[model samples]
Target: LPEDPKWEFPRDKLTLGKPLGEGQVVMAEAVGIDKPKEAVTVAVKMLKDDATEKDLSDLVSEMEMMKMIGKHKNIINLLGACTQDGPLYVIVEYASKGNLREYLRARRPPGPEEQMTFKDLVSCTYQLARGMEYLASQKCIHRDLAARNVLVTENNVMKIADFGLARDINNIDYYKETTNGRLPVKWMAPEALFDRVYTHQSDVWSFGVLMWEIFTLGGSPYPGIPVEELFKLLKEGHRMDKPANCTNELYMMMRDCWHAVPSQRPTFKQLVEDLDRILTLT
Candidate 1:
């Protein structure tokens, strides 16, 4: 079982506002003061009445990771949390622009400089890679690495968020799932899909899918392919095709991330380096 957060927020001080967005859970705007005179606007998730023990446990695990990696710029930091009250609240730094997927989807035609250029997309990708690299260094696995899990600020700064499925593997390189549970099929590697194995390499595979999402302007991977058919297709070595606008080099990098063998996938360090070189050219 995960331990409780070291710090707690005052229940009265925190005020829930309009909802920011939601996934399997709802996130809303919250305001409070952390310091004597400083006002803070944070994203808050409240544990609902319907939440199961497993859901609460997952929330605790996520809070633990947030506290552990509190100051990383590329990662979302925990603002404060209220766990003693009837409804537990987990507050995190608010990203005004919301998740990367929604951000990209809402992009409009450029008015000379407003449109997201290829360079802008690459910058987002690089920021995500840097965040994942930091996670790799900390021996953490972001099991849910995707455009939906990454948040973008108003200034276009990319921050990795959503650690509900993250795990700290301080002394191990891999974690194998022991139960039959829900999995993000499209982003998972072949090994993980078949054997429930997760590793840094598996994350690399998901990164590739995420890169595809960026290049395709938030398009879904393997679109129109049934979930049941994904296993067979992947087993036969069928991979998602590159976006029409994706550069050959960038597409090759994505391909490298999807290698059938886990060991063949590039490390986050190498990915950062590769993306750096690509960014330099653009």
Candidate 2:
């Protein structure tokens, strides 16, 4: 194997300050470095409770995967890990602006001081597509791709995060889930919902719904449609209608991402190219 990037945070040099947020399994917080106080603000994610065997394995695997997909502008870079002893900790670069979903919520209803333009929307989505494109090139499938899974920096750069579900594939393009759990039904493709399969193409399908979230200022997809009815709706070819302010060209690209057949869906490379073309003409 290749040499691992020295992503092991020295236990003595790190200080976990305060809670940034809490998720299903891990809790993240602001961390300080003894060497360079202002040089960087990092976040440490450690398991919430006593680590189970499965949780420990998953954390270690995620750390390894983070090292493998290292240093992309659009993907959050793993600065280090602190898993040698004590509680398991994964250190990563901090994003001051938090997740994209909350970011949109703050601006939606479009207050005079927080209005977002069409160009801004396109730009953010484009950045996310670029991030996903990089992940695809790495043979990494981000099983969870949604606004909430993306983190935004203060400068407006979007970084893909929540890599707990991300994995590298060599033999096949798809991975089958062995266990059932809560899933983002609104963003999942038909095959993902029914067969428990995930691929880059399914991510593209989720990308379409993510675009819907973007255009709608983070409105829930399939509003008034219950989860119980979602599968039937999808099987019947029902898709979320274009957001009120969504343009025809943007909507068309989103539609292409939702192609029923996985092979028929556009690759991340294609999506990036088309988005670039659209931006150029804008």
Q: State which candidate has the highest lDDT.
A: 1
lDDT of 2 by residue, 1-282 (tens): 222446656677776677887623233433343245544567777776656776667767777888788678999878877776577788887888888888887887633128577888888888989999999888888888899988899678999998887788757868886556446788888887878788889899999988988888778889999988988888899977888988999998889999999989999999898888777766
Q: In the order shown, what is each candidate's alpha-carbon RMSD?
A: 2.7, 3.1
Candidates' TM-scores? Answer: 0.91, 0.90
* Candidate 2 lDDT for residue 229: 91
Residue-level error in angstroms, candidate 1, position 240 = 1.0
lDDT of 1 at 183: 57
Local error of candidate 1 at residue 150 (angstroms)? 1.1
Candidate 2 global CA lDDT score: 0.80
lDDT of 1 at 261: 90
Error of 2 at 28 (Å): 8.9
TM-score of 2: 0.90
